[PDB]
Amino acid sequence: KGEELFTGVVPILVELDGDVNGHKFSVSGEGEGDATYGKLTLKFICTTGKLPVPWPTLVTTLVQCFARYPDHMKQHDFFKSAMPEGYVQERTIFFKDDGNYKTRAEVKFEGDTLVNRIELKGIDFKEDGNILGHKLEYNSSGRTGIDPFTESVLQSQATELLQKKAQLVSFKIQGIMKRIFMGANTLEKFLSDENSAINDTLKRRMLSEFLLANPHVLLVSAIYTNERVITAMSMDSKIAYPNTTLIRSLKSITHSDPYYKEVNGDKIYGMDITLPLMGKNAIGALNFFLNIDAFYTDVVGKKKSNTFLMGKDGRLLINPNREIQDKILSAINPDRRVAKAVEYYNQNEAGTLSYHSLSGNTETFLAIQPFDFFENHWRWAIGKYVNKSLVFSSHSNVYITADKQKNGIKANFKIRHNIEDGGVQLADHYQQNTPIGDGPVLLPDNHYLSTQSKLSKDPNEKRDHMVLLEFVTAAGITLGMDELY
Amino acid sequence: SKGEELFTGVVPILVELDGDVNGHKFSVSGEGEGDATYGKLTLKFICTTGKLPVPWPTLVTTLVQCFARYPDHMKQHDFFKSAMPEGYVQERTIFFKDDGNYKTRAEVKFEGDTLVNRIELKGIDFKEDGNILGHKLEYNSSGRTGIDPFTESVLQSQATELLQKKAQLVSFKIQGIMKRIFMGANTLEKFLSDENSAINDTLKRRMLSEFLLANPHVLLVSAIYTNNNERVITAMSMDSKIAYPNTTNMTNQIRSLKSITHSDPYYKEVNGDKIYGMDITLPLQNAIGALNFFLNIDAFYTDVVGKKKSNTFLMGKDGRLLINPNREIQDKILSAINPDRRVAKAVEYYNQNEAGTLSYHSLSGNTETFLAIQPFDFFENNGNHWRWAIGKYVNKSLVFSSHSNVYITADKQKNGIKANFKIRHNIEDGGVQLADHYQQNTPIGDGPVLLPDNHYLSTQSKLSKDPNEKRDHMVLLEFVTAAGITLGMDELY
Numbered sequence: 001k002g003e004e005l006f007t008g009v010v011p012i013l014v015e016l017d018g019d020v021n022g023h024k025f026s027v028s029g030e031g032e033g034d035a036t037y038g039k040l041t042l043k044f045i046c047t048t049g050k051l052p053v054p055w056p057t058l059v060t061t062l063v064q065c066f067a068r069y070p071d072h073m074k075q076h077d078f079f080k081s082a083m084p085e086g087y088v089q090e091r092t093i094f095f096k097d098d099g100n101y102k103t104r105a106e107v108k109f110e111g112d113t114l115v116n117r118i119e120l121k122g123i124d125f126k127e128d129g130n131i132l133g134h135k136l137e138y139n140s141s142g143r144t145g146i147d148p149f150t151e152s153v154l155q156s157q158a159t160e161l162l163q164k165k166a167q168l169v170s171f172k173i174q175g176i177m178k179r180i181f182m183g184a185n186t187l188e189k190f191l192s193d194e195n196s197a198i199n200d201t202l203k204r205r206m207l208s209e210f211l212l213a214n215p216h217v218l219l220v221s222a223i224y225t226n227e228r229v230i231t232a233m234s235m236d237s238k239i240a241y242p243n244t245t246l247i248r249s250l251k252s253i254t255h256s257d258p259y260y261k262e263v264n265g266d267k268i269y270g271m272d273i274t275l276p277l278m279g280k281n282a283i284g285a286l287n288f289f290l291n292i293d294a295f296y297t298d299v300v301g302k303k304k305s306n307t308f309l310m311g312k313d314g315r316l317l318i319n320p321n322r323e324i325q326d327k328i329l330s331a332i333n334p335d336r337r338v339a340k341a342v343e344y345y346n347q348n349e350a351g352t353l354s355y356h357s358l359s360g361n362t363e364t365f366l367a368i369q370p371f372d373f374f375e376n377h378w379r380w381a382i383g384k385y386v387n388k389s390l391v392f393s394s395h396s397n398v399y400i401t402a403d404k405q406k407n408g409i410k411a412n413f414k415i416r417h418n419i420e421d422g423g424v425q426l427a428d429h430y431q432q433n434t435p436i437g438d439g440p441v442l443l444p445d446n447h448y449l450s451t452q453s454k455l456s457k458d459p460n461e462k463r464d465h466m467v468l469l470e471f472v473t474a475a476g477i478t479l480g481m482d483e484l485y
Numbered sequence: 486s487k488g489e490e491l492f493t494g495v496v497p498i499l500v501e502l503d504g505d506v507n508g509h510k511f512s513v514s515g516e517g518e519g520d521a522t523y524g525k526l527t528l529k530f531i532c533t534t535g536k537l538p539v540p541w542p543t544l545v546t547t548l549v550q551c552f553a554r555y556p557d558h559m560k561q562h563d564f565f566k567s568a569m570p571e572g573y574v575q576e577r578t579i580f581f582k583d584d585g586n587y588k589t590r591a592e593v594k595f596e597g598d599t600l601v602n603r604i605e606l607k608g609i610d611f612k613e614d615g616n617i618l619g620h621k622l623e624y625n626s627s628g629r630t631g632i633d634p635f636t637e638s639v640l641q642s643q644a645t646e647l648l649q650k651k652a653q654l655v656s657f658k659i660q661g662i663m664k665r666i667f668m669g670a671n672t673l674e675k676f677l678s679d680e681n682s683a684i685n686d687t688l689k690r691r692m693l694s695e696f697l698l699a700n701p702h703v704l705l706v707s708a709i710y711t712n713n714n715e716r717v718i719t720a721m722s723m724d725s726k727i728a729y730p731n732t733t734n735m736t737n738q739i740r741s742l743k744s745i746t747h748s749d750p751y752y753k754e755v756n757g758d759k760i761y762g763m764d765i766t767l768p769l770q771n772a773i774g775a776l777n778f779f780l781n782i783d784a785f786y787t788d789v790v791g792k793k794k795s796n797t798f799l800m801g802k803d804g805r806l807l808i809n810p811n812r813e814i815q816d817k818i819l820s821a822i823n824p825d826r827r828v829a830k831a832v833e834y835y836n837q838n839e840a841g842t843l844s845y846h847s848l849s850g851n852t853e854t855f856l857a858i859q860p861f862d863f864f865e866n867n868g869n870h871w872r873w874a875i876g877k878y879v880n881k882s883l884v885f886s887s888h889s890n891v892y893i894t895a896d897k898q899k900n901g902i903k904a905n906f907k908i909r910h911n912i913e914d915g916g917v918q919l920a921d922h923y924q925q926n927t928p929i930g931d932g933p934v935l936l937p938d939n940h941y942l943s944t945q946s947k948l949s950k951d952p953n954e955k956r957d958h959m960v961l962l963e964f965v966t967a968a969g970i971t972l973g974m975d976e977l978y
Contacts (some may be wrong), residue, residue: 397635484887
């Protein structure tokens, strides 16, 4: 019921009202979540001026409702269950040898927006100490609480997953293209030389069917060299038969370089694939225009995603950002490491690589999956990429446990903040979540939530601010008493 | 590594152990198979000298990491396979705390198609009344001694998701194949529907043959004309050749047809072979005739099961096995094959068109099986009729057993690898018997090998017995996988 509210991208708003040692301040946040992937993209601004505390101290306080719960564990999800009315989330954060935060928040829906209103009160802080003195670092470093084996598992998983998703897109593209070429061959067999057996009217019906069976094709023409051309074209839902006009040397399948075709007032990106009708080996040729733009949803999906389709020389055939379509990768991105992707492509070998992204000043991890769309001329490649600095950052964990007396959940965990020039500042978290409203909620079995966070800055934001990117995922030993926990 | 190429399929395993522990000489012979693709090992070990003087669990690490599953991105770090086929020497010293120690030297190499493991083991300084020589260790692991709950949470969740995902991926491929059949069938219907056109029967035969050529999962197709020039044009995909057989009161059932239909699955006799399939019959404002084709279900064997046998099945109405690795249970219902009533949860998933997992006891052996069911429509109803389901299953007791790990590190001097690890054997009335392992592997041949970056190998093992084996023996099932922080240490630490 609440899971249903987290099916697409959800707009996030967060308002924090804070007072630490008498220093009052306010933080406003905006962004979006996708629980399908556990992705959180957030920007926070301090509206009162300078923030009196380090930004890292307020991350756990500033939405576990966007945690990715594997389908087998979607019954242990209280955060989404409490939606749409919401949940109260109170914490006490003890900074060792310093003050403590007391937070009370309300995470609820206001229309399509998931809101997080927070009241925070801090006391007993040292004015010269790591918090009020701003001596904590912006992001985590060092091996303090990182299990190498655990991180090995998770990293290997991430890399395999990225590689697999690229493979799965390729297969889907190949499926679509296989059918086109299979049908094109059949057309070739009938249109070859069925003099009388096939009258032009019957030929046209075969051409229209080809288009109907393969919506990724815009038009198809049989060019006979009774020099003539029977052409069919797909206008919206409707097959029309335009009267084009005008081979010989052709003796093998060929395709044009991709280009834009003007149909109506739209420019459609595609390519012309011409197949000879020979006969006695050149009776004519069959040509069709492959609508590459018709693959947008097949490559990128219904929601924007980090997927691209790439051709000869690293040319972007499909991309979420339409502005870089038809542009070469190495000509758009200065980072010369991108050339590894064209190299993978040219060697018809799948593989990963790292490069700097123009969009976002982030290190990007990219999986390239080359594939032949017909059995380097007939070769494309899928690209799946992700924020490298996020995906291979350390995981912090919270052991979620049910509190029956309060129809809710509880959790205790330790955040370790890096101190300037050496050492760790402990922040001992105590949490209790209670639903808003007396409706049925899912009290879960014990399980873990695992978070990767990366802090950054908006180069164009003049005010005191934090950009927060996170992955949040749920894991548990729930169907496996076979290990004897 | 040209070695990895030797581990592409299932590989036969043989293991010979020659043992001496405090003067008690013994010999162990092992047989089985590995698939490095999945990290799967299936082994049976026999003691040929009589009773084994040591507990079987003490010998599982001695009695084949060449079969570890290495992710593509970590392949350059697979020393074990890179040393093949010439092989590697694997020496260990195993210190049993407050007791004796094993010294093993083994040679893991190829002898023909068989990966062999010849082991010489020498044990000294053991207490005759102690956990080893006194047989006071248990058969399998128990208790929370050295399992990180979080780590096991990750791995278990991964396993469950993976199993569910693989079922989904087979379903899509089946749907792909079926989508084209029905797309082509519709086109046939459009052309064969106008008998009053210039579509001569000869042109109809060509369209029918193309349909078969484009869709090799179809055995034959017939256009049955009823309401004028009573005739039947049939094409059949014979031995790589499209032939045109000549058939001549199912004429009123075609007259009765008012939507697409399929027969119940059955076996059709073509030549001397029974081909399992079903008839799909499509009508040509009434009923000019019908188009019928026979869907060869057996033609989906490789699409469902793969080139190597695997734990996949294709299931129809009432839990009927359409495709299965074991051909003997084809056409049989799941609930009528397996006594375990929990199998009915599959069938329930199927009827509700909802994916999900379940547990049941496998006829196979005495194994608890974990099964993911993925229902899917192979044609677009509000009823079943046009629904199948994929089943992916695995040994539940193995997949959700604890993982033991070894930190593999390179030894540059000896052109090989090294590792230290600790196994905790459960003591009968008691606690844990530590077994501190020290390992050093060196290649046999003087050829190039891959010295790896540091990484982990992770093993799940389950010990069992063959009820029909009268001799002292161990049945060992294992998963072995490789994991590492290789392309992301900087972003991390």
